[PDB]
Structure of CUGBP Elav-like family member 2:
Amino acid sequence: GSHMQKEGPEGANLFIYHLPQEFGDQDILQMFMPFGNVISAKVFIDKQTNLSKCFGFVSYDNPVSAQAAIQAMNGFQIGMKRLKVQLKRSKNDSKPY
């Protein structure tokens, strides 16, 4: 259950390059569900920092659920596209929040 794009603690963010066949909001919510709860789903190009185009955005709640999705999501073969996953700017530190 989500409505826009707002990440939580320092440690969890991954985005999708090469998005296969029509892959829209409904697919991303259930095919990326099987290791825990997700806070952002949208297939738009972000118009403020001009990042990579016709591409996809997902986010989770804690740094342990990112390490399992990089192994089962690097390599997904479906027709004439491959899935290729990238994490957005890593950081491991203790902030007062």
Notes: The helical segments are 25-30, 64-73. The radius of gyration is 14 Å.
